[PDB]
């Protein structure tokens, strides 16, 4: 009919959603978590240091074996690091040096990488010739790639600079399901432990829960006040944390559909580059735009520790699947392991 | 000690040597970022010297290998990926002078130049200002006054004066004078003069960077 009716319809729908949220929200997480013993101070030491990269490291991911990890730097090299011996397993010369995201397949057969070059690249590691080669080259995206994660050897999700997300079939190289609900640049993705749901954060300060099979957005969050730079699912898949450039970190629960608690501090004025949960979910590690990475109590929201071992902006942060150690990358080209 | 990991050590050493060689090779080359309002002014410059989201162009001039990156096809928020070029040697800002008569575009170009030259990431990287379409600009001068978009302008409608006025207006946007230097050049469909000016600017930028690293400049 006319825009005047659709706008007011959307407004009243949003008002009803807010009223339902307020009615369901009976108590805050602080009052209920007060009965939990605080974790106290958690001191961590750099057990390993990796100095193979010669440029700013932007993205990395841990392998399912909790020993191997892939590191993506803008020097045009993907280095598979043996965390135990710090040995370089493979060095992949990238066709485009301007990469800012990479993923390690769960089985370890393939690894993905992308960035300013909208065309992704799937590299097969276990080739019979012994040399890494691109198995597939996804080129359907129009914006810079920001985050990608493997659902399987034949399925991979990928976010881009545009306000869209896609699920690609590596066998044929076609988008199986395209998500377009977002209104801002999708910067980070995180797959749920069940491989059924995944949440995406964008620059519109909102988080949307998308299904890998259905493709319809279930829940939408708008509790942040700036661009969401990082996102990570709770180890049980029932909640997730969101890092934004306004130094605010908000933990959102799927069942509650609202931020349970916010992690912030006066001295902490810079944004958050990466966020990662521990195996128990009690510790929330977040890498900030500064040279420090802080450990936050996922329930009490207290600074359990600070990994101030870097000298440049912390770019990536990932905890091992076994929870034994956490790798923190920085723009200083170094990658350190903490535990 | 180890039995088989001892060979993995040699493999990692070879990989590290290859990484060092590749890094040295990359450092031997010079990186340039191509920006500006309008695709024509950038396309002509990309064409005048040469051997998706982002395009990488190569060209060698007087033993120097230049790497020019065009990011006009991104069409995404720059503040989320502009930091990727924090290490480029110089920025090539291409703008057509004829924009002053086409719909106001001069104001957008000036805004983009001010946003770029005053960005925290590019605080140290100089910018090469390419004022393209000098011939068309000269032609437009005799037709419409320059005050259409510059109300404060007061002078004769001659090519040289208007060109100098626009150059001054553009360079004045830099708020880091003591740190930046703008190499302005008027160009059109031309011979190697353009790549020659690019080479001359890159050489001076490299000399000044070395002097700053040594504490002289």
């Amino acid at each position: 009919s006319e825009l005047d009716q659709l706008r007011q319809e959307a407004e009243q729908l949003k008002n009803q959603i807010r009223d339902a949220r307020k009615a369901c929200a009976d108590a805050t997480l602080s009052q209920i978590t007060n009965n939990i013993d605080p974790v106290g101070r958690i001191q961590m030491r750099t057990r390993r240091t990796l100095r193979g990269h010669l440029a700013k490291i932007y993205a990395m991911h841990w392998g399912t074996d909790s020993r191997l990890l892939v590191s993506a730097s803008q020097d045009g090299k993907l280095i598979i690091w043996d965390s135990y011996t710090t040995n370089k397993v493979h060095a992949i010369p990238l066709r485009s040096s301007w990469v800012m995201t990479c993923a390690y397949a769960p089985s370890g057969n393939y690894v993905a990488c992308g960035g300013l070059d909208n065309i992704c690249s799937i590299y097969n590691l276990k080739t019979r010739e012994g040399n890494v080669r691109v198995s597939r080259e996804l080129a359907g995206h129009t914006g810079y790639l920001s985050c990608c994660r493997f659902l399987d050897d034949n399925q991979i999700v990928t976010s881009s600079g545009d306000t869209t997300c896609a699920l690609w079939d590596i066998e044929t190289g076609q988008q199986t399901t395209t998500f377009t609900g977002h209104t801002g640049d999708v910067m980070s993705l995180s797959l749920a432990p069940d491989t059924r749901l995944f949440v995406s954060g964008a620059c519109d300060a909102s988080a949307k829960l998308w299904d890998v099979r259905e493709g319809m957005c279930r829940q939408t969050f708008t509790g942040h006040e700036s661009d969401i730079n990082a996102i990570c699912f709770f180890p049980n898949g029932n909640a997730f944390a969101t890092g934004s450039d306004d130094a605010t970190c908000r933990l959102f629960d799927l069942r509650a559909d609202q931020e349970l608690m916010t992690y912030s501090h006066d001295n902490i004025i810079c944004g958050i580059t990466s966020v990662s949960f521990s195996k128990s979910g009690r510790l929330l590690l977040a890498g900030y735009d500064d040279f420090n990475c802080n450990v936050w109590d996922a329930l009490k929201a207290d600074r359990a520790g600070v990994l101030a071992g870097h000298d440049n902006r912390v770019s990536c942060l990932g905890v091992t699947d076994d929870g034994m150690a956490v790798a923190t990358g920085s723009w200083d080209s170094f990658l350190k392991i903490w535990n | 000690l180890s039995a088989e990991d001892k060979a993995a050590v040699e493999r990692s050493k070879m990989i590290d040597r290859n990484l060092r060689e590749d890094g040295e090779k990359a450092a031997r080359e010079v990186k340039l970022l191509l920006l500006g309002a309008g695709e024509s002014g950038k396309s002509t410059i990309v064409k005048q010297m040469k051997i998706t989201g982002i395009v990488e162009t190569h060209f060698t001039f007087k033993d120097l290998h230049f790497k020019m990156f065009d990011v006009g096809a991104q069409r995404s928020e720059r503040k989320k990926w502009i930091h990727c070029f924090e290490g480029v040697t110089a920025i090539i800002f291409c703008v057509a002078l004829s924009d002053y008569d086409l719909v106001n575009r001069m104001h957008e170009s000036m805004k983009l130049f001010d946003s770029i030259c005053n960005n925290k990431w590019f605080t140290d990287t100089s910018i090469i200002l390419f004022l393209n379409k000098k011939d068309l600009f000269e032609e437009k001068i005799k037709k419409s006054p320059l005050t259409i978009c510059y109300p404060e302008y007061a002078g004769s409608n001659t090519y040289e004066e208007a060109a100098a006025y626009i150059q001054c207006q553009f360079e004045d946007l830099n708020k880091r004078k003591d740190t930046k230097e703008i190499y302005t050049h008027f160009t059109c469909s031309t011979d190697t003069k353009n790549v020659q000016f690019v080479f001359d600017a890159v050489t001076d930028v490299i000399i000044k960077n070395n002097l700053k690293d040594c504490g002289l400049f």
Partner: single-chain antibody
């Protein structure tokens, strides 16, 4: 992946000959090369090894100083120069590639080899419990071997290797490190061990299983193969 050895034929005692082998279908510069010879009746024996970077060249005590191993990466060819070879050196020489990294499968490919005939301690001994064992289709066979010392390195990896040489073909890697099967090998094979006593089971034995099963340890560079277990159909 293909390896074609060359430089065989008859040679007089005390002479010299240079064995060569052209490599194709893989990154020769990335793989390390090994030389394994098989006497007309004896089992396999390690001869020489050269790393991917032409460094850390090692020779067995039986051939140290007498033979020479060299590789030409720009030419993609391997060369084994034999100087004043003895009569005991008569054996068919097989070329073997290797790549060493976490999760790698070295000795995964063996060349066809060429016949070379000369005209008329301090190593891990693999004491094979048996030389021949009768088997039938559909049944199961257990091949076992013993080593001088526990191959279980401090890192928990058991440097044990099991090869199978079918009649009329070069040996092929079945299981490496006692816990991982090579690519292209049926999953019905099962090898295990406690570090000193090892057992190799073959469930659902087929006609393709006939051959000689050679065991090898990689705890120390002086590799010493076993006597080989020949199965009768």
């Amino acid at each position: 992946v293909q390896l074609v050895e060359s430089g065989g034929g008859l040679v007089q005692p005390g002479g010299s000959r240079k064995l060569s082998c052209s490599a194709s279908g893989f990154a020769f510069s990335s793989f390390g090369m090994h030389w394994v010879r098989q006497a007309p009746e004896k089992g396999l024996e390690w001869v020489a090894y050269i790393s991917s970077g032409s460094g850390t060249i090692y020779y067995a005590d039986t051939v140290k100083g007498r033979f020479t191993i060299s590789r030409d990466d720009p030419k993609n060819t391997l060369f084994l120069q034999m100087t004043s070879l003895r009569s005991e050196d008569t054996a068919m020489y097989y070329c073997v590639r290797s790549i060493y990294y976490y999760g790698s499968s070295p000795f995964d490919f063996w060349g066809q080899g060429t016949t070379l005939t000369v005209s008329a301690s301090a190593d891990i001994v693999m004491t094979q419990a048996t030389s021949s064992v009768p088997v039938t289709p559909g049944e199961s066979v257990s091949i076992s071997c013993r080593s001088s010392k526990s191959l279980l390195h401090s890192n928990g990896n058991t440097y044990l290797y099991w090869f199978l040489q079918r009649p009329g073909q070069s040996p092929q890697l079945l299981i490496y490190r006692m816990s991982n099967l090579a690519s292209g090998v049926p999953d019905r094979f099962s090898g295990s061990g406690s570090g000193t006593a090892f057992t190799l089971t073959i469930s659902r034995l087929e006609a393709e299983d006939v051959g000689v099963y050679y065991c090898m340890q990689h705890l120390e560079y002086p590799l010493t193969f076993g006597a080989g277990t020949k199965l009768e159909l």
